[PDB]
Design a binder for this molecule. Sequence first.
Ligand SMILES: [Mg+2]
Lengths: 298, 298, 296, 298
Amino acid sequence: MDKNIIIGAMTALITPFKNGKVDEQSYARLIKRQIENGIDAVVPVGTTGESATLTHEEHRTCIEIAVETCKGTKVKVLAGAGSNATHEAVGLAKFAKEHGADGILSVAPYYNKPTQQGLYEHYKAIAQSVDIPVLLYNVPGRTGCEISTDTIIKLFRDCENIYGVKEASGNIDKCVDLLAHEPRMMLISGEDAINYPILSNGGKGVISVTSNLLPDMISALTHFALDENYKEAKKINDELYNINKILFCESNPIPIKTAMYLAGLIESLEFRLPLCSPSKENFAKIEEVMKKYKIKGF
Amino acid sequence: MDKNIIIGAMTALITPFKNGKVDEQSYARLIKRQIENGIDAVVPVGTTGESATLTHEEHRTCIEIAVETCKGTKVKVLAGAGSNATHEAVGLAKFAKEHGADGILSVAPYYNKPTQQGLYEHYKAIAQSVDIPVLLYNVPGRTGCEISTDTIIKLFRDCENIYGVKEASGNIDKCVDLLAHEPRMMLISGEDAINYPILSNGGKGVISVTSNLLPDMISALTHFALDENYKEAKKINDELYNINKILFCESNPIPIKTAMYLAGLIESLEFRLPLCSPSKENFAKIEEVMKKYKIKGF
Amino acid sequence: KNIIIGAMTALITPFKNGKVDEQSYARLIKRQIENGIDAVVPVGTTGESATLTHEEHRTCIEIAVETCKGTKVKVLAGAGSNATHEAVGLAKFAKEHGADGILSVAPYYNKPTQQGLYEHYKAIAQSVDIPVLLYNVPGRTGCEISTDTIIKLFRDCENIYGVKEASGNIDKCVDLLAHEPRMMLISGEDAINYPILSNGGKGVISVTSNLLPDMISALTHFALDENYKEAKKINDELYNINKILFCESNPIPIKTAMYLAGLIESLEFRLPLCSPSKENFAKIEEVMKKYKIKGF
Amino acid sequence: MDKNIIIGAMTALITPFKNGKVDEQSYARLIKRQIENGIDAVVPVGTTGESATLTHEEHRTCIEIAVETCKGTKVKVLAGAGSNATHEAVGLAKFAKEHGADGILSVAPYYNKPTQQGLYEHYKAIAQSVDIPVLLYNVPGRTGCEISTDTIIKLFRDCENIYGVKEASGNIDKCVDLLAHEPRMMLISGEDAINYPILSNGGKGVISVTSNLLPDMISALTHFALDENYKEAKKINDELYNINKILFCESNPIPIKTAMYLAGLIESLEFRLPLCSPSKENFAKIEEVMKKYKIKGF
Ligand SMILES: [Mg+2]
């Protein structure tokens, strides 16, 4: 077999805005900070990057910046490129490739609730359209559908490029199911609070929200775990629980961008509708939780 | 207060394909069939019409065909125009108006899970962009979010054009809450099996899947209920239960397009990925359930 | 069949110094009878069946039977268990104490399969000679009696005559009555009493009626007589109180309301139930002030 | 704080019937088989032991047999003693102590849905009634209520006897929460498929269904994990996934008793209503899954 893979400590990059546009210099600065704090790959325009409200041109711009910023380093770019329309997801995958992405993260179709057969055909079309690695992304709370274990495994076996899945499903039983039946895949944590449990069961990385704020801590947790230093990895996972939970007190990326702004890491607490600022109470909750953590500057 | 409204028996039109393109002649012929069977409005490019996978040029085509076909008739066009990006939902509402729609149906943002404040701001922007009726559309099983009762009522009260909500949420308690607190709105059933309970509680129409296949029966049900002939409305609702439920044995519009094909009302059983044909077992179930109903031809 | 339908009340069970307040219980039942109620349910969920002893179960059923004697009002006794042998025994017990019928909750905790639920209820129904109403409340039991199982039991067992549904699932109510219109669908969810009745439901077993018996009976009887406009008007007026009565697990809010209304002297439960939070206490307090609460 | 504890590999004992009565000779023989296969504690009359349908005399009989069978060995008896009525749960706790149990497993109140405050007072009264260890048992899918992390932690800290919780909630996030905020407690897996993830996060034992059939494999999994031999523990957990899942194809203990019968370990496949035999379909599925496993006799 021997598929090409992108694994390790990875970050679902927030997308900073200034005056309604992507702040490209801030975006670059944030990526450099991830690289300097032990991150192995970055994910431009994932859910956390507000992919839904960026234009396709902004999609390109963000991917190009990530690629340029990672040159001269080992850090890879796993570009968000996914859609609930298969023709669009295919086109997005090819564009990501054309724009220098090392691999793609492709979310399960949201809203239109395809069957498992439909999911198989969707991802097969996507994988056949490019020659770079493809990571599936299961997040049923947002999409309204679940890629089943059987479908994930069938895709992994049938399509050379498809090498694993980012799970954001709060279902450790499924994580056991996946790796028990197909130990060759890369299971990637899409849920910060349970990064350590997923890694300790043989998961091989994380695509993290929390790492935007605490890249050094997420990187350490991940690399301790990858080395079977489980006591060390669990210690950081336990320490991170409070922040990992508060970062979801309202829908991601509302709390993470709020945190980045509070920390002085971005200049404006600005979103695109229908996302908006958190409630005053949640703003204050996030602020208090942060005080317990050492937040790396630039 | 005296809002412009679009109510009564309405159909979420399927979109027929032929060789990967919208079958334009067939779409017109299906709409004419709805008109001739007592339907009060049609909804081009809703969920049932595969809005997700149609291009923006195709949305335009479908809306224009609906508008042309209903011209010279009492039938209104409530065009699907909705997005999880507020800038895009505004654009699409303006476009729908420009192509002659009488009103728009605007789905709650899917996938990105805005907060109630976000939803308020989203819909306020959409309502402010046009001068035609706007019906909200709540379908949490597909979007991952819920427009709360309070948000819906605030939108109804604050925004001239917003006149009610299509509820597809299996939640009769919420239907009670909505009409007990704001009896002036138009609550529309987006769930065929429970059309009668929604209407008998003061709901004022349906946006129906089943009516694609059985337009005369849905329109009769609806009109009886609006005339307070609950006995006759319930009789048809009970008779329709079997078909109403089998049309969701797989994600809509997979079963309804299967039925339309079986009835000889569309030429090709064809979807756009990630949607695809049903399993052999479900196909057979749909075929058998159909036998109990009289299906109108052209 | 032989049936018990109409407006019915899931009686709360008042405590004083950790004992069933037998005086109070009789008095509260009298108050239900005098406010248009068609039947009472001693020792249902609302009655804290879980924490009463078998002797107290007997006592409440006896007091209900006695208070309704000579009156039009029937007693549909709570008599259910997650052990079939015990549910059979409680059914016989209820009939012995002169109940007109029993309300029998789906087994909680042990999650029997549909085949198991059928055998459970078949065993009970074949054991006594009085009406049996199934009672489906998946949020509390961890299982659901499916439409197919409910219909099969109704068709197969002469004395099983319907189901109390507490499942927030109007689709299922349509399913049940479309496929088997002869059964008695009974609302176990006050906020949606009107939608269940308007689809051909034939009664309610109500929590709210403890506090507002006249309004719940009025609503029910208007709907049974097809005055939907008046039934809906009352269902709408009741929504706020109907919702606040579940702000914490029933019967915590209804006992709180009965206490605040001066209808019971003490706000006493049996553990593990206990008084509501301060925030919820106050909410209940304020919601009640929009309603006329009848005294004795 | 030096709490007394009962941890390690533990079995929720099935209760065999013969001619409608507890088969006492079979029960003793089944317990001896557990002891001889590396089990550290047995749980008579838990959920798996059909506590709901046993009479109180039968509870006494099962506890007495477990107690007697464990004499002369290190194996402990953690007796099921719980109820949804606090007065009865107190009574059962005392009765378990009197019949020689080393500790009690006490299920959250089912059916009546107590609030967090009610749960606190429930378990506080239970803990004050005896001087032996008390393990909480959270199983929301069966009880309709959840003991929150805050409540479990408050009980652990406030009540000398309460030493931990058996979690059967499919919620590894909550397992993280519990041990991150209160590392001194004994988190026990009540969900076989996820035994390894719970143990690798610092859980200290399992109360197992699967161990009825495969006590040596569950014992080895547990002891490898407790020694931080995570590779070896995970390997068994993976191997066991298929049997762990099929043992819940119908409500436990229906599949486990079916497996014991198929294995020749009990003489009849007998339940007390409302429990009953599995479908013929599921009977066959269980039989097929077992073929892959080595099963020890007596
Ligand atoms: Mg016109």
